[PDB]
């Protein structure tokens, strides 16, 4: 409860970029995998997925606003141990129009409890769940959309 964290500093330095790797999780080839995917997928629906992987209180926090121009096409995914679900997914309301509430527990639940995490390691279970995503996001809508996660089958 730190009047809300908003740290600058902890942003990257130059241009911006759409994973913020505060924690360490990824090497910088997994970081240039989300940035391509994360590219793509706004290319093709205008959603904007950003990843945020940290351990509070050690966040940008509120500095991301600004920085990733936070609006209702955005999902922000926390990736932070420390918190509750450790995959957290801020989902703006233009996003949460088209998925299933139900989705985001689900993806939660899949690649981000705490014996995947701990088994498969931290950059796994984030490239997995942003594949997901990416899944979902680029579906048809329907009354079965994202109803079954990536990985499920295949
Ligand atoms: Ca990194």
Do not use: H, M
Request: glycine share 10%; hydrophobic share 35%.
């Amino acid at each position: 409860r730190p009047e809300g964290v908003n740290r600058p500093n902890l942003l990257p330095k130059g241009e911006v970029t759409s994973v913020i790797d505060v924690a360490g999780f990824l090497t910088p080839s997994e970081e240039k995998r989300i940035i391509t995917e994360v590219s793509d997928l706004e290319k093709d629906t205008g959603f904007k997925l950003r990843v945020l992987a940290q351990n509070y209180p050690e966040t940008p926090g509120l500095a991301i606003r600004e920085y990733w121009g936070v609006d209702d096409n955005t999902v922000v995914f926390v990736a932070d141990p420390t918190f509750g679900d450790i995959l957290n997914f801020n989902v703006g309301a233009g996003i949460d129009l088209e998925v299933p509430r139900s989705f985001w527990g689900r993806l939660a639940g899949k690649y981000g409890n705490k014996f995947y995490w701990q088994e498969n390691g931290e950059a796994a279970s984030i490239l997995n769940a942003v594949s997901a995503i990416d899944t979902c996001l680029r579906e048809e809508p329907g009354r079965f959309k994202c109803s079954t996660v990536q990985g499920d089958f295949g």
